[PDB]
Amino acid sequence: TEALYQVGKEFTSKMDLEKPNYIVPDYMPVVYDKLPQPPSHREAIVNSCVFVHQTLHQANARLAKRGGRTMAITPRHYLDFINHYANLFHEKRSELEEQQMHLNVGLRKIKETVDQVEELRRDLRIKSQELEVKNAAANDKLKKEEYAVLISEAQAIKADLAAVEAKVNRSTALLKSLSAERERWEKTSETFKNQMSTIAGDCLLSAAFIAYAGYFDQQMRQNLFTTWSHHLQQANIQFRTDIARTEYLSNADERLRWQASSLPADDLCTENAIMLKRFNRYPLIIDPSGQATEFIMNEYKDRKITRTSFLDDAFRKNLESALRFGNPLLVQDVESYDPVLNPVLNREVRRTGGRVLITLGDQDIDLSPSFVIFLSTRDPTVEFPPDLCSRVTFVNFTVTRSSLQSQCLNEVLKAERPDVDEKRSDLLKLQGEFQLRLRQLEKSLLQALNEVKGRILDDDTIITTLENLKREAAEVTRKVEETDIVMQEVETVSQQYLPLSTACSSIYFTMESLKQIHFLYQYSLQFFLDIYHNVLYENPNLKGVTDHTQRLSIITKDLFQVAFNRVARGMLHQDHITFAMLLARIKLKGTVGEPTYDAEFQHFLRGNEIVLSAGSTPRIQGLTVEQAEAVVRLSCLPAFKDLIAKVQADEQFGIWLDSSSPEQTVPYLWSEETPATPIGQAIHRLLLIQAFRPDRLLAMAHMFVSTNLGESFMSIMEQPLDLTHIVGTEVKPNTPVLMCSVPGYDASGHVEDLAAEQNTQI
């Protein structure tokens, strides 16, 4: 802790980090024991920086405790954070200062114009009085050659007065045209003092996010940011909360360019692009889906980024060329990382005689400043040694629920309603261009007032530019609302297909978590997209259906069925009930007319955790001690409060308790104020069976799936596997057919017979 504090304080010395009005909180979240009792603003900042490093250790221990894959946190991560903290502070401070200066100049020029147009009115009144005197004197003297001169100079004043009033009217129009700009600029100039107060806190959160949060998923990244934000709030360090880190660490122009480079529109993905643009250590990218590798290739295309792999023999030559000519390089298969890159990643260079020499292997090589290397893997579960983790910054491209919902909503929109999707995609392009145009006009309008010399009225060209910029701004603004209303009509159409996209994300993440119960249950995102692709376009049930609602209902029904069939074919039969049960819960959550059943399912899954004392069991007649214990636990639910009385009052209860298949005729031993739906009926039957006849729980679980998903939902698993159709249609030539069997079973005969029947040589 002392080492981190000393490193942080020393590296932050160049930083301002000075705030005389800093108020020491009643309790300081001190992390350094030898921190002085009255800490200053700089000391509190460095203390917070140390705290960020320690919480990364705690976060890793948390995930490790939960059997999660963790990467080692090293002092190089700390050095990256402090370096990013220094860089962001200087960049944010320099940007803010220039903005305030630019706004100060524009406000002064507009204020000077206001004073000028005010004095023009007085000049106009004086000129009008002069004209009246000249005209009256000329007419009166005419009432009596020289008088012709008097009326001629009076006409000259008439032209001069008319010209002045024309300039006054034009200038009055300019004031109104710049009014809104003046009001906005005053507010930003007023809030300018606020941004400087919060820059130190904001840059600490941002720098910690880039240096540390790359490897973790969406949920953990929020946990670390919340943990850091809580520490800064409790340590009386000012930081803004309204602004998202995506917009703080990147500009709209860069985000638009990232979209043009095929970067998916996701907050996590945008953060990854920010890390790939602001990295001290060379990035290590994890993307099983592969958009990150493509995004890097298009982003550095103008720099001719070279693609290669560690397993390739030409990697050494390719790396040597990149180190010499300074071209960007992307190397894949880092799970087979080749250690000759250690000096390159560590940036161990010797600058002697104008030559930046790096010793690659046994050869000394001159290093070009434009060199940059990206290392990528397609394995999200790959483990890395601690030294490799220290030498790179992690950039994990994980799939988030929000992004997958948007992807599936987009895919169904393109499929079911292509015209609406085409309209929506056009409005994406139109709105982005309009926002870009508005930003350009604002900068141009500010720049014109920054470079204008003297007063606006002095130069007519400046006035014309201001009028044109406002007219263009007003016109581009008008296009914004009309695109907004059309985009709004698009969303009301997208609302109908929204529940389906929500279901799609739920299925995939259930499949993703299926690996927790068996190592063989590994399902990629592409496999789900193939299932989603099959339902949308290869659906035999959509042959003649034209209703949009009817087609949607068929798609939703078939999505659950096709997902079950494909997954359960590569699952042990004892786990088929688990997957269909969870799919039934997913569909149940998607029904508006059904209750949540949150408490019922909570007891169904954690009913054994309800600790009962010795006197808790009342020893109900006709029930085993273990059966009686399960009854009291079930009695905790409101619907089973009087279960014991109902059980005791039933003479036929003993007959049902010894029935061969009690799940078919479960008696009505629950009290409801209103009649329950058939799904709710099965849930209570499931709860009763678990307490009384656990040996029939699997049979009753199948009944619930029949109640929710259908009687024939699991019927296809009872039929022999049809390898003819699946291989010919559902399997791409790129996807291998993994035929895994329990001992005593060999599927080689299946392939031999299948190959003969197609008359395909194997």
Curated annotation (Swiss-Prot):
Superkingdom of origin: Eukaryota
Ranges where the record places region AAA 5: 249-478
Modification type N6-acetyllysine: residues: K176
Subcellular location, record wording: Cytoplasm, Cytoskeleton
Assembly description: Homodimer. The cytoplasmic dynein 1 complex consists of two catalytic heavy chains (HCs) and a number of non-catalytic subunits presented by intermediate chains (ICs), light intermediate chains (LICs) and light chains (LCs); the composition seems to vary in respect to the IC, LIC and LC composition. The heavy chain homodimer serves as a scaffold for the probable homodimeric assembly of the respective non-catalytic subunits. The ICs and LICs bind directly to the HC dimer and dynein LCs assemble on the IC dimer. Interacts with DYNC1LI1; DYNC1LI1 and DYNC1LI2 bind mutually exclusive to DYNC1H1.
Disease linkage: Charcot-Marie-Tooth disease, axonal, type 2O: An axonal form of Charcot-Marie-Tooth disease, a disorder of the peripheral nervous system, characterized by progressive weakness and atrophy, initially of the peroneal muscles and later of the distal muscles of the arms. Charcot-Marie-Tooth disease is classified in two main groups on the basis of electrophysiologic properties and histopathology: primary peripheral demyelinating neuropathies (designated CMT1 when they are dominantly inherited) and primary peripheral axonal neuropathies (CMT2). Cortical dysplasia, complex, with other brain malformations 13: An autosomal dominant disorder characterized by global developmental delay with impaired intellectual development. Some patients show signs of peripheral neuropathy, such as abnormal gait and hyporeflexia. CDCBM13 is associated with variable neuronal migration defects resulting in cortical malformations.
Family classification: Belongs to the dynein heavy chain family.
Entry's free-text remark on domains: Dynein heavy chains probably consist of an N-terminal stem (which binds cargo and interacts with other dynein components), and the head or motor domain. The motor contains six tandemly-linked AAA domains in the head, which form a ring. A stalk-like structure (formed by two of the coiled coil domains) protrudes between AAA 4 and AAA 5 and terminates in a microtubule-binding site. A seventh domain may also contribute to this ring; it is not clear whether the N-terminus or the C-terminus forms this extra domain.
Protein name: Cytoplasmic dynein 1 heavy chain 1
Source organism: Homo sapiens (Human)
Lineage: Eukaryota, Metazoa, Chordata, Craniata, Vertebrata
Residues of the full protein shown: 3099 to 4066 of 4646
